[PDB]
């Protein structure tokens, strides 16, 4: 029928609707052989099969749409794309491709690229590179974040001011409430910015997280597990910055939640051609940094924001080594309190270590002088003091009603 | 049509340029490759291709013109330079090249140099080496640094002189303002020196950062990114200290601004033939070779160089490469997070800084003026110290204060 809708229909109703059309019972296959075995048996009616994809040009010259909803994972039901197709349009991997798609002919192994209709959500012959977009520096444009989870939303809000396009780094140690962090901004952003293009990308997660994660947030989510090769890491984090600097070249504002620069540089530690500096290969490091890189503020518009954990105190090395790596790469960086923590004090942010460069870009001047007196209190104070202070004077109520009360 | 006019046209220029050219549109490759295209179709006529680059000369003998707005990136636009003109020239890398180019006959990848016109800025065929030029001080010929904003280069005048040849360390603990303080240091060298080559040398720097100081200062600007490995960051580096020599070489006066020294150093220290905290002895050699090339040259021209050196990152090494550069400088600003976590915006901690043989710097009447100064400070702390500095130093401008002030 329409092949995306059929790869988002549970796996039961697509069985159902595959023994529906004769085909014999395929209930031990996988979801993906079950809808290419349902697409070409639904080949008697031309003009139907619709089709749409990420694009991945492999070095022969020809490439895949690939679907965001296994995670970019190739499977059968990728569509092929001529070399041809690709030159005809200027096509390139990270393109977003609608269109009409054709049962393979005898010898293919593939639906194949019919007609193009979209490329990128625009005329397929309608945008110059994110490699040349002069990169203002990110924070002109604020992405500000009466509930408790607001709460979060809320400490944040003070310590580190997020813009269109900042490069931050969320530094947490383990059982620090780092998931909830991010799921409570991914909600804070689909609520309050649905403009901007929200994809969540999750590194070497467990499999139930994912599904969690998948559940509650508005937007993309990529993954890949432990159970996958670090191949398949690297993979699933060069597509999404890919079809991420497309959609920018659109004037766009893109974000990635990225969880765990450090996990994927673990990736690319392990798929990187072997200098050691406690288990990394310095080499490795350097397509990570560019994953990160990216994230920039552009000039002639849009905006690729990228927020990363980066993972500490896991006892090992490595991770320690990726960490110190990173440090002074970003422009915003929140850190999580193993202490606060371990107290059960939850939006456990160490308000005196976090903070994002060129505040006064993403606040007005009445703004930052406020911030600016909350900050000269929070200094002498501890860790979890500081918390606990402001989270039972945020209790009091919002935002400004908080500052402007206080002040008697 | 003209390689670096060419250069330093905006892509969208270059795009809709291109265009007119009956150029199949080309908005989706890179800013060089853009120009290489252009390049190509402007095959004819044959008089009217000009280029001009710093040369890079490979082992295998022959040498690349690269060029400055890419930081000397290698790339497809770079013009080739043959063994037989590097030769019939004696050039050497360093060595900023103009003249004529002629497109890739079939076979080859470059447009090619075709007749060398001006070299170094000077007739091709008219210089002793950097390596054997007398090393003064340079403590003689100083460069002084109505608004708010002079109370910076004021501060910086009065605590530490910077003379054209100064090897000076910039030494900064994070956010204390030290990328001010060099925007400010670049934007006195321009209004007030713009007689002398500005230099401006990114390290592993932030994208946006870059476009930032490209935007402010008025010279050059060369950076390499963090994106970037190690092998470039070193590269950028080494390409920017030649083109500095040969401009000396020449009797100029020429100043880098050496964002992290440490990070260079960082960059060293992978990119070396395999230690003391991580880092491996043997690679701070270059990154001292690098600063100590600083001088004020007996035979005319200088090469000063003031460079930051990072610290309080909580990172081992950048701890013990600040370590390594203490006293190879002759002029130090020390910057203090004290200072800066009360927004006083200056920094600059007044009792450790200093430059030597200020008596070169400075004639005899200012020089005791600061010492009178120095004497008042020296027991005030850090804070204290900026803070009177500046409300004394808001009342008016250089000497109209000290005169009145005294009675």
Redesign the interface.
Same mark, same amino acid.
């Given at each position: 029928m329409n092949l995306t809708e059929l790869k988002n229909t549970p796996v039961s109703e697509l069985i159902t609707l595959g023994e529906n059309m004769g085909l014999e019972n395929l209930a031990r296959m996988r979801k993906q052989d079950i809808i290419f075995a349902i697409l070409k048996q639904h080949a008697k009616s031309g003009e139907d099969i619709f089709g749409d994809g990420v694009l991945e040009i492999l070095q022969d010259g020809f490439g895949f749409l690939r679907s965001a909803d296994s995670s970019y994972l190739a499977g059968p039901d990728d569509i092929y794309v001529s070399p041809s197709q690709i030159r005809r349009f200027?096509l390139?991997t990270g393109d977003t491709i609608s269109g009409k798609i054709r049962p393979p002919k005898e010898g293919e192994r593939y639906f194949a690229l019919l007609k193009v209709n979209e490329v990128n959500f625009d005329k397929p012959e309608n945008?110059?590179?994110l490699?040349?977009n002069?990169?203002?520096?990110?924070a002109n444009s604020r992405l500000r974040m009466g509930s408790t989870e607001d709460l979060t939303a809320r400490v944040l809000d003070l310590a580190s001011p997020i813009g269109r396009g900042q490069?931050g780094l969320i530094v947490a140690p383990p059982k620090a409430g780092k998931t909830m962090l991010l799921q409570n901004i991914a909600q804070s952003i689909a609520y309050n910015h649905p403009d901007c293009v929200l994809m969540v990308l999750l590194i070497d997660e467990r499999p139930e997280e994912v599904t969690e994660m998948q559940r509650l947030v508005k937007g993309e989510v990529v993954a890949s597990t432990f159970d996958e090769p670090a191949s398949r890491h690297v993979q699933v984090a060069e597509m999404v910055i890919e079809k991420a600097k497309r959609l920018v070249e659109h004037k766009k504002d893109v974000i990635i939640l990225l969880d765990s620069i450090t996990r994927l540089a673990r990736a690319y530690n392990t798929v990187v051609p072997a200098?050691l500096? *406690?288990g990394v290969d310095?080499?490795a490091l350097?397509r990570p940094?560019?994953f990160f *890189?990216?994230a920039?503020?552009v000039e002639?518009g849009g905006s690729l924001t990228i927020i990363a954990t980066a993972l500490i105190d896991t006892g090992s090395k490595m991770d320690e080594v990726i960490y110190?790596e990173f440090? *002074?790469?970003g422009?915003m960086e929140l850190h999580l309190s193993r202490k606060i923590a371990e107290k059960r004090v939850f939006p456990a942010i160490d308000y005196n270590r976090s903070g994002t460069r060129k505040e006064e870009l993403l606040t007005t001047q009445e703004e930052l002088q406020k911030m600016?007196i909350l900050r000269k209190i929070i200094?002498p104070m501890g860790e979890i003091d500081a918390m606990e202070f402001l989270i039972n004077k945020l209790a009091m109520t919002k935002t400004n009603d908080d500052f402007f009360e206080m002040m008697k």
């Open positions: 200027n390139r945008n110059k590179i490699f040349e002069l990169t203002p520096l990110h490069r200098v500096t *406690g310095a080499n350097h940094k560019r *890189g990216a920039r503020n002639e110190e440090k *002074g790469t422009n600016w200094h």
